[PDB]
Structures are given as C-alpha cells and as structure tokens.
Amino acid sequence: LRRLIRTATSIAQDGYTREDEIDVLLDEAERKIMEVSQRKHSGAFKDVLVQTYDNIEMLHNRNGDITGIPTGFTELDRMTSGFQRSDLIIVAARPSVGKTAFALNIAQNV
Amino acid sequence: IPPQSIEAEQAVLGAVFLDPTALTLASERLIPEDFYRAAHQKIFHAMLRVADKGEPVDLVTVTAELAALEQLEEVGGVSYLSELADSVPTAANVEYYARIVEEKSLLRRLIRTATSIAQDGYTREDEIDVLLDEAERKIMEVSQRKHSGAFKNIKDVLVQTYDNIEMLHNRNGDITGIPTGFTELDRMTSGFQRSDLIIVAARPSVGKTAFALNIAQNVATKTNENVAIFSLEMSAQQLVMRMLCAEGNINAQNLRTGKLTPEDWGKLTMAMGSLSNAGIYIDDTPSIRVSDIRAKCRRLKQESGLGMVVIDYLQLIQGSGRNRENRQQEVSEISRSLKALARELEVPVIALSQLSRSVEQRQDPMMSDLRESGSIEQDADIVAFLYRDDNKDSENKNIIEIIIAKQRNGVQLAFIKEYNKFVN
Amino acid sequence: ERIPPQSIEAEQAVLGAVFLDPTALTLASERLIPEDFYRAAHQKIFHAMLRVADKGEPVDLVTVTAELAALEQLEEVGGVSYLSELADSVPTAANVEYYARIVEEKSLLRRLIRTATSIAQDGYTREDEIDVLLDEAERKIMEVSQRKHSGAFKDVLVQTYDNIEMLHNRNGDITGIPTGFTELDRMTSGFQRSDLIIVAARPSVGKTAFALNIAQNVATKTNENVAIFSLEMSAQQLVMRMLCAEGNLTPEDWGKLTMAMGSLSNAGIYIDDTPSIRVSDIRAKCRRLKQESGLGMVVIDYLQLIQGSGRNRENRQQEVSEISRSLKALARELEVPVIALSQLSRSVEQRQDKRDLRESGSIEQDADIVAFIIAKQRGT
Amino acid sequence: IPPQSIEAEQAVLGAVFLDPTALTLASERLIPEDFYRAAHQKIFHAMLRVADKGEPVDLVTVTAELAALEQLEEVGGVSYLSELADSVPTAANVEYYARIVEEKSLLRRLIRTATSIAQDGYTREDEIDVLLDEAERKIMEVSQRKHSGAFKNIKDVLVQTYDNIEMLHNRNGDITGIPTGFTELDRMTSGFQRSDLIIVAARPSVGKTAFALNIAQNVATKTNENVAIFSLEMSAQQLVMRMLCAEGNINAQNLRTGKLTPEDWGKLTMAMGSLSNAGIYIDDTPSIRVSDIRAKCRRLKQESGLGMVVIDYLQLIQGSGRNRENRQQEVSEISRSLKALARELEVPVIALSQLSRSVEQRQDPMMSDLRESGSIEQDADIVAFLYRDDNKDSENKNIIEIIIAKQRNGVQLAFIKEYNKFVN
Amino acid sequence: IPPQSIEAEQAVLGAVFLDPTALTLASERLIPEDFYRAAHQKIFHAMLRVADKGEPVDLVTVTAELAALEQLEEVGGVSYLSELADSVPTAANVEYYARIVEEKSLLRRLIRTATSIAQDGYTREDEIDVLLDEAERKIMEVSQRKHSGAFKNIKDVLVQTYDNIEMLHNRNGDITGIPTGFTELDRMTSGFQRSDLIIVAARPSVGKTAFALNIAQNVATKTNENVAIFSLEMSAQQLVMRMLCAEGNINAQNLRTGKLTPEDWGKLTMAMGSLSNAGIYIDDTPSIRVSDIRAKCRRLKQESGLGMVVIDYLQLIQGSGRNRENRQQEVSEISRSLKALARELEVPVIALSQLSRSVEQRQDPMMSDLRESGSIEQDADIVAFLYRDDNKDSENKNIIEIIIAKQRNGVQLAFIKEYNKFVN
DNA sequence: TTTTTTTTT
DNA sequence: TTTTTTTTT
C-alpha cells in the first residue's frame, strides 16, 4: 500500500513536470502501476494428463470442432487445424527465404 | 495548474472560423470536454453541433447555436468569437494546435486518475487485490484515449496502387521541365521540374558521382539553363576530367596516363569544345555551410541564369547548428533548408544522398534505408535509388537500374566503365 | 543596459521575423545558432524555435509559445505578452536576412573580444608555458576568423588547357628545380614553388634515401639552397649518407671521398636534427633563413613525429592534419616547395606477406601532390 | 603585474661583468627593450654598445658608456653595477637566465598585443574583415620573436664529419684508462676512461648481460682495478656461473647438467683459479635505490679500491622519486645521479640500457631509440649499441657488431654461444 | 570505549551454568583476561579452576570457588550468577558468543600495542632501527593470539575413513524412508529420508532433469507418497512428455513427431495408465519465490499428502532478498530456507543444483565445484553429483555414474537415450 | 550554480 | 546529506 501510493504519486507530480512527453508518460505510467502489482497467474475462467489426452486426440484423428483459420497451406492447416485465437505465433528465419513473403502469404489466403 | 493551453485552445476555434475544413480535422482529435476553458467547451460543443445539422461551419450559425442555448453572454459574446477568429497562426496547421490541446487534455487525466488512486490508496484499506486490479484497469484506460485507429484499409491502398500504375502507362508526353537526355527517366520525371527538392541515393563505388555529373552534364549541353555542381569530395578539375572523358569517349585512364593518341587528342580536344559553349558552374570547396550554398546559388541566378544544382552528397555538408553527434538532427536542419531552396530559385536542387560505412558493410534499396539518415524523405519531392550488381565475354558494360522510390506527382541506363558515363 | 557589443533591436527583429512568416526561421537558421543571441530570453526562444523545428511541427506563435511554456521558461522569458510583442513588431519578412546578418556580426565581435581576453588573462596566469601559449594564442585568434578562400591575387577549362599543354609539349617557361631525375623532372618540369609534396612508402625502400637524394641533386647542381629537417637521425648520418652517395678504407675511397666532400662542402644545404618538432619553429627558422641567405627548398623527414599541436587529443588525422595544413600554409608563405616523407605499414604488409592512397590522412587533409606512384597533382 | 624577473634580469647583467663571453650569448637571445626595469635597459644598451666599439666588456667601460650618456646616477650608479656583478648564481648558466628574461618579455607582448585587440574590438566597429585580418597578423607576430634560426649549416657539419673521420684514423695509441682486453673497442675507447658515465644499449636475448660481464670480467683479470657488478635480474652465483664458463671454456650446459668430464673438471677447476686472484664485487639485490648504489660503490673505493661499476640494466633500478608512470622522468632522475656518480669515484659507471617490450616487438639501432627512454643520451659521455643478426656449416659462432653512437672525445667482436663469451 | 561486549560476555558465563559442555568449548577460545568486565574475569577464572579440580561445572561450586577467594560480594554475588544463567540466548551457540568475546578482546590489543608504539615513537628517538624491529615483532604478536591450531591429525581422519568404509559394507538393509526404485542408490540412501535437504548436482546436457523426474517418477508409481515437481525451465506438459516416454518405453521422437505405431499407441496409451493412478504434482511457473514454494508445498501436505519435492535446479529460483549481483549470498538466503523446508513438511526436498556457463566452459566432479555456488554444501544433508562421459557397436546406451559427495549419516545407473530414462 | 551545462578545420 | 546510498519480468 505504501509503495502503491508512492508510485501513483510519482505519476502525479510527473504529469505536471513533463508537459511534453505525453506518449511517453502514458506508456511508462502504465508501466509503473503494473510494476507494483504482479506475482502469480490469473485469467478469466474459474489434470495435465487430460490436456495430454485432448492433445493426443488432435494428433490422432487430425479432426476438430467449432473453429477456423485456414493457413491456406494444409501442411500448416494440418499441424494446427486453425491458427487458434489468443495464440502468439512466431516464424524465425535468415534473410531471403521469404519471412515477409510468408507473412503476406497467410494473411493473404486468410 | 493542470496542463492546459488556452493559447493553443483558442487557436483551434479560430481555425474553424477561418475555414470550415478546420472543424472536420479537429473533431478527429478532440471532444468538447477536452478543452480546458469552459467557454471553449460550449463553443466547440456548439460548433460540431451545427456542423452535424448540415449547417456549414461559420461565425453566424454558432452564434446562433450558442444564443439558442442561452450561452452567448456566457462564453463572452461574439466579441470573443471575433477574437477567436483572430487567435490562430494559420489554419493549415490546425491539426497541431488541436493535438497540443489533446495532450494537455490527456495528461490531465493521467494526473486526475492517478491522484484518485492515492486517495483510495488510503481509504479502502479493506480489500487491496481489488484495489490493484482497478489501478491497472484505470491506468490503461488513460492510454486508450488518443483518438487513434488510423488503419489504411486495403481498398484505399489498391485504388491508389492501380491509379499509380495507370499514370504509369499514361505517362506518354511532352516534357515541361528541364530535359534530362535520359528518355527512360525523362519519361518518368516528365522533366526535372522546378521548385523540386530532388534526391537520388545509393551505395559506394562512386556509382552516384558519375550519374549526377552526367545529368548536370547532359543538362548543360542540351538545355540552355545554367547548372551548378557542388562536389565537396571531388575537386574542380577532377570533376571536369570525368565529364571530358564522358563527352569525348576517351579512356580517361589513357588520359590520366597521358597515353593519348592523335585521334584521342581529338576526342579530347573535342569534348572541351562541347562544354566551352556549355554552362557548368562548379564549387569544390572542402565543406561549406548551407548558408553559403544559398549565397552562391541565389547570386548566380541573378547574375547569369540558374537552372540546376547538383550537390555531391549532402552528408558531407557542414551544419552550422549544434555539434557532437546529432546528425539525425543535423541533416534534418540542412536537408530542410535545401527543400526551402528548391523553392526560392525556382529550380531543382538535385542531391545525391550516398554512403560508405553502413551501405558497404551490408554486403551479401528502399525507403527505410535513407530513413535511417532521417527526414530527408519528407522534404524530398523526389527520391531515387541507384541499384547495380557486380559474363567474361566482351562488349564490356554493366546495366544499372534506377529505382525511384518517391515523387509528388508521379527506369534503366547502361553504364560505361571505360569513360565513366551513362547511355540510354 | 550593460555595454559590450549587442544589437538587441536586430535580434528582436529576427525573432519577430520567424513569428511573422515561418520561413523566417529556416533562413535565419542558416546563419544563427541559439548561442548567437545576446541574452537569455532570446537565446532560449530562438532555441524553442529551433526545437519545435526538428520535431517536424511548424514553428509559429503557438508551437513556440507552447514549447517555451513546455520547457518551463515561459514566465521568465517574458511571458506571452513580450512574445506577442516581438511578433507584432516586424511588419514583413524578406529583409530578415539582413538583421540576421547583423546579429551574427555582433556575435562575432563579442566572441572576438572574448577570445582575445582569454589570452590576456592567460598571459599572466601561465608564466611557464611561453612556447605553448604563443602557439595556442595563434590558434585561438585563428579559430574566430575562418570561413572562405583568400590568397594574394585579384575558366577551369583554361586551367585544363594550360594543363594539357604541359602534358603535351613536355616544355616550360621561366622557372626551375631539377629533381635530378628526369623521370620526375619530366612529370613536373620543376618542383613548383609553394607546392606541398609528399612521398609515402613502407619501411626500407629508402624514404629518407630519396629525401636526401632530391635535396642532394638540388643543392649540388642548382644555386637553390635546400634545408632538411631530420627527426630520427643526427646531422652526421645524413651528411655521411650524402657524401656516401656523392662518392659512390682504400685509396680509391680516399680520393672519391675527398671529391665528394669538396663538391658537397661548396654545396649549400642546411639541416636541423631535433628530437620532436613544431611546425611553427620550422617556419620560425625558415623565414629568418630565407631572409638571411635566401633559399629555394625544404625537405622534411617524416612528420608523424612533428607533435606540435599542443593539447594532444587527436588520431592520426587531426594533429597530422593541423600539421599538413600548417605545412602547405608554410610553403605558400615562403614561396618554395615543401617535400615531406611519411609511412605506411600494416596495409602493405598485410597484402605483400599473404601474397594505399587512402592510408595517408595527411594527404587527405590538404596536399596538392602525393607520390608513391603519383596520385595527386594540382601517372607513373 | 606584467611578466618580469628582476631576479633573473639582474642576474644576466651580473653574468656579463663576471665574464665577457656572457654578453655574446646574451645578445643572442635578448635586446635592451626586453629587460623590464628601465635601469637594466640602459645598462644592457650601454653594454652591447661598448662591445661593438671593440672595447671589451667590463665594469669600467660601461660605467663610461653610461656616464657618457648622462645615465649613471640614473641607473643607480656603479654601486648597483657592483651589485650586478654580485646578482648571478654562476655565469655558466647565463643562457637560461637570459631565456627566462626573454620569455617574461615575450608574454608581455602576447598580453599587450592582445589587450590592444580588445580595445579595438570595441572601437573600430566599422570594418571588421580588416579587424580580423590584422588580429591574425598581429598574433602571429608575437610568435616570430624568439630569436630562433639556429640552422646548422652543412659546411659546419662536414668539417665536423671529416674531423671525426681523421681522429678515427689517427686513433692509433697507448691506452690511458682501464684497458678492456678488446683491441677493437679498446682502439676506439682508448681505455674506458674515469669520470665517464658509460652506457651501452640493445635489444633482448640477453646479448648484453654477457658483454658487460665479459668486460668487467676481462677487466678484473688483467687490470688491477677492482670491479663492481649490479645484476639486479641476475643472481650472485648465477653470474659467476656465466663467467666461470667464459674464462675456462666450459660448455656450461655440460656444467649446469653436471655432465662434466675430467678435463672439464679441470677447465672448471681452472676458471675459478683465475678469479680467485681476481677482484670482482657483485650485488644481485632485487632492486635497489640509487641512494644505496652510492653507499656501496663509495664505501668500497675507500675500503679496497674502486675502478669499474657495471650495473646490469638501469631500467630495473628503483626510483625513490614520485611514482605511478613518469618513468620518462624517473629514469631522468636516476640516470642523472649515475652521471653524478661517474664523477665522485673517478671511475667509469658502465651501464647497459637494455630492453624487452618495445625492442622485441619491433621485429622484422640508433639514438632515437634510447631517446624514447629519455635524457640518458645527455648525461652519457659514451653510448654504445650492440647489433647482431640471427650457414648450417659448423665452426659455430656469430659475429656481433658494436655500433657506438656517441662519445665526448672520440668495433667488432665474434660471439661464443657454447661458453657465452666474447672473442677478438 | 575499548572494544568489549558485556552482552556477549555475560552471555558466555550463563552458557556455562546452562550446561557444563559450554565451559569446555569456551576455554578453547578465551582466557580470563580476555573478558572485559573484571567481574567476568574472576568468574571465568573461578570456573575453569573448579573444572580442573574435577569438580563439575555448576552454580554452587563456583559460588564456592569464588567465595573461597573472598570474591563474591565482589563480582556481585550469586544474584548475578543467577542473572548470568539468564543472559544467554541458547548455549548451543556458545561458541560464537565466546568468539565475539575473543575478537573484542583481540582488537583491544591491536589498539593497546599500537598506541604504545606511538608513545615510544616520540620517546626513544635515540635508536630507531631497534624501534622498527620491535614494532614489527609486536604487531605480529597481536595476530598470533587467536587460539588457532586446529590440525586434523591423520589418525582421526583414518579412523573416520575406515569407519566410513565399514558402514559402506554394513549397509545391507531394509529401507525406512521413501523407496527409490534404484537399488544401488537405494542401498546407499537407505531410502530418501524425511526432513533431509537433498541436493544433487552436475553439468549441462540436461542429464539431471531426467534423473530427478525419473526419481519423483519411480517414486510416484511405487511409493504411495505424493510428489511435487518444480521444473521452472520445463513446462507442465513438456515434463509429462518426458515421463510418458519413460514409463511406456516410447521413442518420444517417434512421438513428438506423431510418428506413432499401433503398438506405440499402446505403450503411449499405456504409460498414461500408470500415472493416472499416480500422484504427481507439477508447477512450471516461470520463476517463483521461496515464499511461494512454501505456500504450495505446505498447503498440499495438508490437503492430499506430501512426500517428495523435486525442484528443477535452484539457481533459477527468484530471491526476494536484495538485488544486483550477490548471488553467492542470494542462493545463500534461499537454499537456506529449503533446508528450513525439509524440516517443516517432514519430507525430502530433493533439489538439482545444475549448470550451464562455468561447467560447460570447463571442457577438456567434487565439493569445491558447488562451493563456488556457495554454502549449499552446509545446509544440504545430502549432496550428489552426476558424472557421465561421452563404441560404434549397437545395443545403444551409456553408463552414468553417481558420485554422492556427502550425507549426514551415510552407485551406478545405465542411461537410456531413446526414452530418456534410467535403468538399474 | 535565489527553476540553470555561453568555444576547440 | 546536525554518525547516512527507501523502486525499474
């Protein structure tokens, strides 16, 4: 609570003292409050074997149920059955293989 | 005192009475509650209100809206609206004014929202998880306010893209600017037009020095405009040796060597003839200031007749501004005066943004490359890049490609290593 | 309100100007830097001015009044009232270049008097750095004055025609300095006066051999007097080397040796062998010499050793340059040819072991004749 | 108060009354207007005036010149000239005094000329180009004042050069110093003479340690003078192992190994015999101070009989002076006491300036090399350098060359790797 | 005021009345004259005196000794001895107290002896060599006072060494702790006993992750205790993929690939079966604090049933303590709570101290290796190291060796690369 | 240093 | 800064 009020007050006295860093401040103002609160996991909704069973099914039948995002390339369409929602995807590579080619690709067929 | 800017604020309203287009832009960035002075609140409120009703934006109508509300004697009468119309520097920048208004408005919130957190920090000392949660929510809320969301939809890009390709093919015409003896570019350029800050960029191997010279050059032979060449790196006669080899088709090596024939003496004796009647004005000063480039360009126009200005790579120009590693800014200050200079002498200030360090080291072009060099891209009405790669079979040459990456309202040349020239 | 040089009124104009037409700024900015302005309010305002510039925002009564108030100096820069004042002040904006020009002048004069006064207060405060001070006292006044070209006397095609003749006939008219080697005698027709010569090479090819060479054939066969400054050896090793090459122990040596000595004895050469040297003494002595005996040449044995600047913060480029330039300068002052010797090593060894004109910053600084091998002249 | 130095100034005049040669030198550096005190002005003026007229420089004559002018009671009478004659430390340094006078005189001008610039800075505010120009001229004028111009004409060098070669060939004679069993050098040295700070320098490979030892050594066997050896790097017996191998012609390797024969035992048993009657005085102390080198050299002379002093490389001597990287100066302080020591014990302090770092790293000698080491060259009455290069055919040896680069009033040795010795 | 520590001092005496064993230790470090308060002097004097006479150490006896001397009413009577008995924190640390007493005692001397030097510095100003000598002697004398000399004689080491080897061979028995399905270790461990801070360490190649898992694993299958796994580096299911391959004998590659057969589907479908009834509790949180490891271990024991805790390499645990490069200490603070945790949940906190940087870089184990990691060795009741080296002939495996370097009251496994498991 | 970092081809 | 180095997955 003390350090909570301390940070909040930082922004305060700040807002006035930096009338020319609006983009900045806002971004670090978020930063500051965030840095006082984090510890463990959260989410939105109120055993791993299961998850590893649900996983195996997906590996077996090569099926699915209620969803859809066609990579436009069955290769990938097969190894995902759709680029799931809320997922962070990454494609790394060295220059000239078409990192951007690919990027446009997907979004293109999508 | 809360962030605020009457001076900016009142400048906004006034912008609207100076031209309705103002309001459109304004409404994009702010909302009545963003202005600090109450008066300005109602007056904006009023304004956008009437603009909605179809009623065009102007003094009278709002006076109306305002009166209608029982708000005139409140916001200081038309007398102030009069003032308002006076308070702006120039509508054309109405955006900025508004922005500035927006900011001072936003910071208010970063502060108010924060201050409220502290008060609650002390009060509800009976459920802190909750406290922290909303302290996160609230803050984020402050950031998502700047009326952002300027996504350039694909439909708008395509039309633009297809309109760019149609002009591409419709570009069959008669030059109306300084003719560039290079039909390909010429067909694109439509003539190096006057008042245009012309920038052409590339990598080492001096491939650029040759191309500018050859322009200014073919420009001095055919057009009757006078040309100026600022080769800081290259000297007076050093330069002329390069065009003499070019106009006469001499193997300059044969020449530097002095290994000249009797027919070569001719070509040699011949190239000169060409320029004798030419109009080429050089300056190889070590490194000059933009302040001087101006005095000499300007003075010539008034003396003989200015037409072109080819400065051999801008990077090497000395910036009067403040020193010790702010080149991003340094260039920003000078490259910006050049654009200001393409304007005064009503001529094309062709410049060659070239390089050594970063381009050569990238062994194994486009906009992001010169953008590193900073805001030259904005001032430039035309940006062009030179791209060439490096058979054992003779009939020795090398096809260079011209990739112009920009042009306000808008190629290929074979190169010659023996005479350092350029051919169509 | 106080009194040294200052044209407050002009300054007010320039500021005012920008306000009246943004363009004013960008023109002023071609001639003035915040520091230029006499006092604080202005100083910073022009700054704000200059500041909103860079951002990419259009400079005008708002962005300045905003930026200024943004960098909290507004109420004491004069506040909005004084601001608007300078503003309503200027009536137009196309003379500004004038007032600006004056402002600058004031700037010069002030900084002129400021530097002069530096030396002053200095003379008293450093009674034990006489050599030093003098050298940096020059430095200081020089640093306040330079901009564009000058000379002594009150089209390039021509110069390129005069050049071609020299390349053609291989002739000449009224002048003379025999390299003693037609090869060179042919590629110059004489080591022209006021020219800075350079001969770069790697260790053991005879950079010094050559040096003595020229000066040798120059003082022996010509009435010209050559002075040589050697920094890595004694007046003996040199002269020994000289009559050593002039003579080409047994009796044939005694006779050939005496012949050389008599011939070089009558020769007029002048040497100096001091540890490290300052370009300024070189000229110091050479000016007097040229007035006492008169002479037409000067050979330097590798300048990298001419630590003569003073502060010592520079690479192989700055102190080497200040010298190079000071050299040329020297040559022009004396109206004679200055030939120096320099060294390369790592580059050439790099290539020659495994199996150039860039590796010599001095020549890049300011010489109009470099030689390996020639590479600059105002072929092989 | 303007730079000035009465104390120095009056020291100058006095130098002249202490010896006319003084005036000559003086006139080289100053001019009457250089002195600060008016009195000294006239008195110098007077002096050089009479020296011109042929009249030798002295008290009486000037008193005359002075009186003649109506200037005596002015410059304080002879009484002061008396004083004057008293005011100097020692004429022999009259140069310095004068210099110091010159400087204080020159700075005056750097200040006066400058001050005048500032006054004009404010006055003529009506043509500044001109102002700047003369501000450049003026200043430069200040520098070109130190009566420089000491060009050693080629005629003077040659005569010197030929006189050096004649003494070279006339050097056939009888030693008058400590005989060095090395006929070549000996013919040059004419005998390591007493009161001489003797320095011999070179590169690594310890090629030096052997040569000094072998000297002190051949010096201890034949001459009857006593010798001292300061091998800081090398230990007591370590050193003796090196000369024992040398005087007996033993393959020390054969010895360190203990791989000695019955005839070898002899040579071995023999070398010792030689030195038994010899007079060698070592000291291998880790690193001593010049203060100690003195107490032990000096004490021996008074006890037994001092003659030579071979200190194994000076660099490794500890300097009592001030620390942390001023070796240029450090050596300057100690190397200078050694020269002071060649004087007290009336003996030759032979030292070996050697090296490791800079000499070895310069893989692929002369004065500039040790000059880096600093002012040893000035104190040394004799400096010598050892130079040796590095056929598969036997009769195994290597000819080393001795290049003596200096000597107040003034070779080749074959080397032996098997016994680490030296032969004529 | 002289260094002293009544608070410590009186804590010492009291330690003795709280248990005679105290005196023994005490006499090891101090001597009556070491205590500062006179009272404590006599009281200690008295004490050790009676302990000598055979008379056991206790309140009465000393009261006696003391009275006998005519010293009671002096040192404040038994009343204070009463107090004395009260003044200690806990005898078990009596050493420290004494030490602290010793120090404050020693510094006294560094100061007294020094101060006396200064007084003499001024007095005998008539023979300084002598002065310096004893100034050296004296000081050294101060250092040689700490009753040092704790040489572990070879006889004591050997007996220990032979007693260690006898228990080695007598270790044929019935487990009384958590059975580890690894007969070799098991024969050594005698069962991973509860309340034991268990540490196993090694180099990269993840060779460790497999071994802990396989333990916790074989522990979850057979024993009926519940197991916890803290693989910070490895994720929830990532871990389970590793044991599923292990319990079913599946070529996980075959599996990650999805290249599974119908019999493989079995093994696959089979491994799971095993764990279904198993009791494995993971947590792959990025990096947690010791404060959390506690809340979750502790909470489970109370909920279901805690038995083991395998945290996948401690180094990666976040230390709440003070930051920026004091890991030596950081680990010292957390590794120490783990030992405190092996105690609370009456279970074995097996940890794997592993590495990347220093171990891998040492290409070309024992205690000194983890000691660099600092004081884990002290807290650990058991430390074990894994050592494996890296024929082309099949029947493909690799024998790993287990080198347990420590155990309060106290192997070899073949490894399987195809399933990442371990076999007896 | 009583709301503030006044040079060096 | 009237015996003293209060943040930054």
UniProtKB/TrEMBL annotation, chain A:
Signal peptide: none annotated. Keywords: ATP-binding, DNA replication, DNA-binding, Helicase, Hydrolase, Isomerase, Nucleotide-binding, Primosome. The keyword rRNA-binding does not apply. GO terms for cellular component: cytosol; primosome complex. One of its GO terms (molecular function) is ATP hydrolysis activity. One of its GO terms (biological process) is DNA replication, synthesis of primer. It comes from the Bacteria. The keyword Hydrolase applies. Belongs to the helicase family. DnaB subfamily. The main replicative DNA helicase, it participates in initiation and elongation during chromosome replication. Travels ahead of the DNA replisome, separating dsDNA into templates for DNA synthesis. A processive ATP-dependent 5'-3' DNA helicase it has DNA-dependent ATPase activity. This is Replicative DNA helicase. It comes from Geobacillus kaustophilus (strain HTA426).
TrEMBL record, chains B, D, E:
One of its GO terms (cellular component) is primosome complex. Its EC number is 5.6.2.3. Keywords: ATP-binding, DNA replication, DNA-binding, Helicase, Hydrolase, Isomerase, Nucleotide-binding, Primosome. It is an enzyme of class 5 (isomerase). One of its GO terms (biological process) is DNA replication, synthesis of primer. One of its GO terms (molecular function) is ATP binding. The keyword Plastid does not apply. The keyword Nucleotide-binding applies. Pfam families: DnaB, DnaB_C. It catalyses: ATP + H2O = ADP + phosphate + H(+). Residues 171-424 form the SF4 helicase domain. NCBIfam families: DnaB (TIGR00665), PRK05748.1 (NF004384). PANTHER family: REPLICATIVE DNA HELICASE, REPLICATIVE DNA HELICASE DNAB. The main replicative DNA helicase, it participates in initiation and elongation during chromosome replication. Travels ahead of the DNA replisome, separating dsDNA into templates for DNA synthesis. A processive ATP-dependent 5'-3' DNA helicase it has DNA-dependent ATPase activity. Belongs to the helicase family. DnaB subfamily. This is Replicative DNA helicase. The lineage of its organism: Bacteria, Bacillati, Bacillota, Bacilli, Bacillales.
